[PDB]
Design a protein around this ligand. Structure first.
Ligand SMILES: Nc1ncnc2c1ncn2[C@@H]1O[C@H](COP(=O)(O)OP(=O)(O)OP(=O)(O)O)[C@@H](O)[C@H]1O
Lengths: 983, 82, 51
């Protein structure tokens, strides 16, 4: 790796040897980031050098390469050209993402370049550096002696700013992110670097823009400043290899070539810019006219962002053969540079009649890279996706996947058995999984690769909107759990909350138009998501804000009542319940063998029959356990009770089976552990009861079992509207209760043992002490205060102890037979302190904590109840429709059944109605963003900047024009004086 | 710790420091009140630009009128030669 | 401190530095947890090797 840099690079002294100087170079006593570094020999292959840059160091690919030449004016350049470098070239390389190849020294042009890059990093916050790459020959290096050690990634403390000597050795500029020190073996001459310089820039011109290539080639430009004769030989050596260029109007050979293109005397123009050797250089002007088309003029039009448009027109003029491929290059490069403001305003004015595949290739370049703005811009020009999404292109869309991503691992596990439908199946299951019309495939594409505005745009253009939004939130939150990195896990949960909010708003407007039609919208199998209803998707995705609306709750009410009227009071339902021939009357409005079946088919009457049958079970269990509980042989009613508990064991077995995973979900719960506990204690009770030696144990265990069967009845009533959410908030108070018991039990030990100690009772059994320490001070909280058990003044004295001291005799069998009188006032004073702390501090601080917790929790408990309420109604729908004394005939029916083994046009009218309300909602939201104050402040700031651009033109251009009219009027008066000379 | 893990730790800290300061700088600059300050400076600049052309063109229009005044009389002096 | 204006000025500038440590350690925690754990529990050699 780091040894590999030596093993490839061999340097010649020609005696060739593998190198040693590969550097994690940085600068002493300065803030620059460490610069990657390698000494390299000439005549080498640029393939492995580019692989060094983009893999071993790791740089992104250029979207543009500009290599700057010059160096005639030595120490100080003109500030007009400094403005051209700083605000023409460096902010262009900041915007497009580009490379600047210059000499990496502090001499010549690289001094002014590094001043320009550092000055631009001052006054710009774009959060990305400007990749400046510098080449320099090994011989002219000042301090190359500190670059020897073959260790690896070493900080070589490179001493800049020291040893000032002129002419011979030059230091390095600290404004470059990489350095390529060309080894010539010459050690002091100017350098034969032009060969590998041209091979490197030609090889970058070979390569393709993009992730896996698949774009146009990286455009390479040259920028010339004044220079020397060797610069002109560098020009013609460059343009022989098809590399375009651009000129300044400073002086020197640049202005020489400008007047050469604005038109013996041409030999004469040669005779004063270098002052030497005219005719060989005249043959190089001949070679200038051999190319004649790779030469552009900058000075005619100057501006801030005019520079990039001049670069594109320098690629239009230097295309060669085809104009159609030239505009194809210009569109795909405007996408590659990620600059809409050029492409919209220069390539879609209507001058060029664009064909279809010219747009489709650019759209593929815009989909493989991440440009939402160009995707919207290219679809807006009348393109059809029915010819676009070839399965070749769709496989190419899943090709550009990051190496350390999640979908890379998931697709490689789908290649174990591309295969996108299996990745959806394994993430989501048999239901809720799509199969494999264009907009649905692009939406699933954008979600699987985690792209934000791509997914929002593809949701806005597609159809079947509400189920696709809830299914989007489902897929995003599943991947958010199955994620490694916290930044991308946070990114998926935020984009999931965006899709949940859009389904809420859309279903809002579809509900405000109609209720019955929106009811047909939700309760429908979406054929893209495995024919799962929208409520099922919002259930699995934990979309709590979707269920917590108003319309969804009213439709859950209508599904609850079923066929009946949803406004039917409870008393009419009960009177219809106990009189089965009162159904066929004018009491309950229906239609919101058939009328009988649509009274008892609702989930309400199944719930009500479940309650009434369960209450009769408790009434029977009490009649057995209180009246007729016989010691030898069970009676009739106890046997009927045994048959009932057998049926409850069967229906629990039907929801336990209804296979290790089902029982793992069955044991993970709490109220199925409760209902399991009631039947373990039941069989323990009966199993002890029929044995002859354990009658009392069986009767006691049955009496403890009745409480568990009674506490089940709180969980049954959580489906009700009025009593529902309050039963939810009961369990969230137990942390305050457990604090109360901690503070109580500490203080109850302290008061108890101190009062039991100051008194000295004579009856000293162990359980009598435990009663007088823990049980009696517990009842003093609830107003049970025995004064006669613990105060001598309410007692009679007596000689009740054969011991020294005073003794007295209290009232009560368990109060101790004889108690002490010494220091009794401290016992009375402990009784006052105990009633103060317990009955005032602890109880009233508990009321304050229940008030605080209740107002803190009440919002989330209402949201959580409204989310779970669908599951409660649905599980009352999938029940045997008989009572628990009559369910066994349906369990046997289920057992012998085990032993034998909308329209289309209403759907189309529904989905068009949905899409209309979608389009009105998006138009309303767009007007609400645009007409705000901050957006209006942005538009006004653009307008004032436009007016500043307009005033600047008339300030200078009228000054020349006023001079021009003054230039005529100056001689017109003298000619009038020459007419007066004729007078 | 070691020494080199300490160096890698402190460079990692300083990277997240620089991203945080760049984010806070963009969040101040792109607010509404700062944009109102920049626009107020731009309008004051345009008031400086309009003030120059108001008076300087008035002299220049007088100067072209100064030539055209005698150019017609010299044309009349040419008409005096006619 | 003796003067109430400069005592108020020091407490305000102290609250500015407390807020900047909160925000910076926020982002260093949202990248990694184990690496930020190695960030806190370390002797700073400029402040007397106090954690
Ligand atoms: N090695 C270097 N590479 C790039 N730029 C440098 C280098 N040294 C100094 N500069 C820049 O040049 C400017 C100073 O110019 P110069 O280097 O000619 O004089 P100097 O070295 O500061 O003078 P002295 O030798 O007295 O310190 C500084 O602002 C600095 O930013």
């Amino acid at each position: 790796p780091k040894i590999f840099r030596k093993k490839v690079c061999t340097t010649f002294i020609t005696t060739e040897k593998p190198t040693d100087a590969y550097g994690d170079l940085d600068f002493t006593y300065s803030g620059r980031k460490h610069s990657n570094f390698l000494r390299l020999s000439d005549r080498t292959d640029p393939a492995t050098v580019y692989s060094l840059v983009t893999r071993s160091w790791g740089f992104r690919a250029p979207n543009l390469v500009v290599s700057v030449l010059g160096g005639s004016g030595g120490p100080v350049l003109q500030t007009w050209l400094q403005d051209l470098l700083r605000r023409g070239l460096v902010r262009a390389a900041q915007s497009t993402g580009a490379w600047i190849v210059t000499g990496g020294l502090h001499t010549g042009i690289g001094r002014h370049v590094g001043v320009a890059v550092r000055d631009h990093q001052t006054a710009s916050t774009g959060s990305s550096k400007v990749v400046a790459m510098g080449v320099a020959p090994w011989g002219v290096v000042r301090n190359r002696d500190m670059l020897i050690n073959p260790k690896g990634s070493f900080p070589a403390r490179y001493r800049w700013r020291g040893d000032p000597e002129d002419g011979v050795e030059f230091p390095l500029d600290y404004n470059y992110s990489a350095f390529f020190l060309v080894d010539d073996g010459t050690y002091g001459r100017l350098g034969g670097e032009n060969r590998f310089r041209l091979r490197f820039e030609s090889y970058v011109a070979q390569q393709k823009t993009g992730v896996g290539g698949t774009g146009i080639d990286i455009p390479v430009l040259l920028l010339l400043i004044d220079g020397d004769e060797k610069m002109l030989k560098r020009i013609e050596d460059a343009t022989q290899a098809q590399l375009p260029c651009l000129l300044v109007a400073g002086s020197g050979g640049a202005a020489d070539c400008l007047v050469e293109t604005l038109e013996e005397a041409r030999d004469r123009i040669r005779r004063y810019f270098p002052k030497g050797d005219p005719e060989v250089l005249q043959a190089q002007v001949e070679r200038i006219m051999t190319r004649k088309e790779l030469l552009t003029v900058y000075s005619s039009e100057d501006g801030s962002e005019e520079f990039e448009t001049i670069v594109l027109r320098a690629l239009v003029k230097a295309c060669g053969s085809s104009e159609a491929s030239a505009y194809l290059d210009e569109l795909r490069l405007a996408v590659a540079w990620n600059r809409v403001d050029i492409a919209q305003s220069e390539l879609f004015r209507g001058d060029i009649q664009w064909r279809s595949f010219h747009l489709e290739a650019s759209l593929m370049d815009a989909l493989l890279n991440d440009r939402p703005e160009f995707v919207r811009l290219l679809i807006s020009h009348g393109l059809s996706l029915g010819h676009f999404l070839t399965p070749v292109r769709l496989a190419q869309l899943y090709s550009a996947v990051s190496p350390n991503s999640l979908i890379r691992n998931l697709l490689d596990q789908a290649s174990h058995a591309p295969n996108v439908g299996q990745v959806l199946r394994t993430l989501l299951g048999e239901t809720c999984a799509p199969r494999y019309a264009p907009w649905s495939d692009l939406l699933i594409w954008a979600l699987l690769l985690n792209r934000a505005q791509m997914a929002i745009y593809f949701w806005e253009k597609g159809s079947n909107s509400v189920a696709s939004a809830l299914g989007a939130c489902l897929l995003l939150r599943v991947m958010a759990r199955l994620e490694s990195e916290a930044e991308e896990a946070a990114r998926r949960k935020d984009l999931a909350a965006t899709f949940e909010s859009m389904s809420v708003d859309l279903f809002g407007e579809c509900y405000h138009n109609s209720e019955e039609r929106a009811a047909r919208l939700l309760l429908r199998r979406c054929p893209l998501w495995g024919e799962a209803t929208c409520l099922q998707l919002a259930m699995q995705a934990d979309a709590r804000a979707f269920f917590a609306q108003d319309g969804v709750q009213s439709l859950l009410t209508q599904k609850w009542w079923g066929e009946m009227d949803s406004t039917t009071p409870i008393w009419a339902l009960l009177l219809a319940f106990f009189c089965p021939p009162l159904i066929y009357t004018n009491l309950i409005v229906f239609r919101k063998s058939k009328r009988w079946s649509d009274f008892w088919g609702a989930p309400v009457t199944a719930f009500l029959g479940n309650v009434v049958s369960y209450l009769l079970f408790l009434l029977l269990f009490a009649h057995v356990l209180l009246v007729d509980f016989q010691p030898t042989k069970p009676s009739v009613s106890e046997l009927l009770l045994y048959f009932w508990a057998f049926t409850l064991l069967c229906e629990e077995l039907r929801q336990g089976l209804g296979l290790r995973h089902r029982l793992h979900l069955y044991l993970s719960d709490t109220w199925n552990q409760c209902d399991l506990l009631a039947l373990t204690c039941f069989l323990l009770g009966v199993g002890c009861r029929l044995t002859p030696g354990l009658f009392d144990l069986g009767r006691t265990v049955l009496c403890l079992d009745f409480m568990i069967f009674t506490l089940r009845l709180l969980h049954i009533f959580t489906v009700n509207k009025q009593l529902g959410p309050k039963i939810v908030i009961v369990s969230k108070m137990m942390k305050d209760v457990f604090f109360f018991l901690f503070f109580l039990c500490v203080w109850l030990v302290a008061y108890g043992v101190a009062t039991e100690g100051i008194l000295r009772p004579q009856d000293r059994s162990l359980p009598s002490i435990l009663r007088r320490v823990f049980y009696r001070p517990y009842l003093q909280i609830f107003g049970q205060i025995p004064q006669e058990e613990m105060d001598v003044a309410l007692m009679i004295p007596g000689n009740c102890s054969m011991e020294r001291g005073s003794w007295a005799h209290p009232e009560g069998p368990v109060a101790g037979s004889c108690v002490s009188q010494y220091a009794n006032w401290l016992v009375v004073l402990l009784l006052i302190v105990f009633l103060l702390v317990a009955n005032i501090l602890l109880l009233n601080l508990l009321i304050a904590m229940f008030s605080y917790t209740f107002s803190k929790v009440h919002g989330n408990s209402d949201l959580y109840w409204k989310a779970q309420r669908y599951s409660l109604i649905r599980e009352f729908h999938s029940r045997p429709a008989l009572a628990p004394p009559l369910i066994i005939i349906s369990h046997v029916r289920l057992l012998i059944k085990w032993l034998r083994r909308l329209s289309k046009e209403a759907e189309r009218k529904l989905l068009t109605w949905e899409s209309v309300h979608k389009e009105n909602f998006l138009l309303a939201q767009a007007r609400d963003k645009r007409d705000s104050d901050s957006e209006r402040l942005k538009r006004t700031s653009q307008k004032v900047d436009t007016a500043l651009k307009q005033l600047g033109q008339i300030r200078e251009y009228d000054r020349r024009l006023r001079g021009l009219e003054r230039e005529v009027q100056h001689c017109s008066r003298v000619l009038t004086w020459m007419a007066e000379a004729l007078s």
